[PDB]
């Protein structure tokens, strides 16, 4: 068995994060869009 499956049989479990990789990617895309289209106005008020 792999390392994860061999360590889970002793109590050690890996909990999944709340924000998945897709949500972090969407957040980064939104930040990039705000930086390109607006600049610094979207981090201080209206875009």
């Amino acid at each position: 068995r792999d390392l994860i499956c061999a360590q889970k049989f002793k109590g050690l479990t890996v909990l999944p994060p709340l924000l998945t990789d897709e949500m972090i990617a969407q957040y980064t895309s939104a930040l990039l869009a705000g930086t390109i289209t607006s600049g610094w106005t979207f981090g201080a008020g209206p875009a």
Binding site: K8, T13, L15, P16
Partner: peptide, 29 residues
């Protein structure tokens, strides 16, 4: 998962590391 004893008494059970086959139900990651 409990919304608080001051609001209601319903609870939700999450079994970490199962497939809804060895415990409505909802299968998540």
């Amino acid at each position: 998962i409990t919304p608080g004893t001051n609001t209601s008494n319903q609870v939700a059970v999450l079994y970490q590391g199962v497939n809804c086959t060895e415990v409505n139900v909802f299968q998540t990651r």
